Curated annotation (Swiss-Prot):
It comes from Homo sapiens. The calcium release channel activity resides in the C-terminal region while the remaining part of the protein resides in the cytoplasm. The chain holds residues 870 to 917 of 4967 of the full protein. It comes from the Eukaryota. Homotetramer. Can also form heterotetramers with RYR1 and RYR3. Interacts with FKBP1A and FKBP1B; these interactions may stabilize the channel in its closed state and prevent Ca(2+) leaks. Interacts with CALM and S100A1; these interactions regulate channel activity. Identified in a complex composed of RYR2, FKBP1B, PKA catalytic subunit, PRKAR2A, AKAP6, and the protein phosphatases PP2A and PP1. Interacts directly with FKBP1B, PKA, PP1 and PP2A. Interacts with SELENON. In cardiac muscles, identified in a complex, composed of FSD2, CMYA5 and RYR2. This is Ryanodine receptor 2. It is found in: Sarcoplasmic reticulum membrane. The gene is RYR2. Channel activity is modulated by phosphorylation. Phosphorylation is increased in failing heart, leading to calcium leaks and increased cytoplasmic Ca(2+) levels.
Length: 48
């Protein structure tokens, strides 16, 4: 709570989250998971 974030680290954090979400999309499309509203295996379509 008390520590202060450098602006450059926050700016690269945005693209870090972008890259994490990109790994999510690639790994789940490998998994079979696709365009989806919610984490629902019955429709087998995936939010990320």
């Amino acid at each position: 709570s008390q520590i202060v974030l450098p602006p450059h680290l926050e700016r690269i954090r945005e693209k870090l989250a972008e890259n994490i979400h990109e790994l999510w999309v690639m790994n789940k499309i490998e998994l079979g998971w696709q365009y989806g509203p919610v984490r629902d295996d019955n429709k087998r379509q995936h939010p990320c």
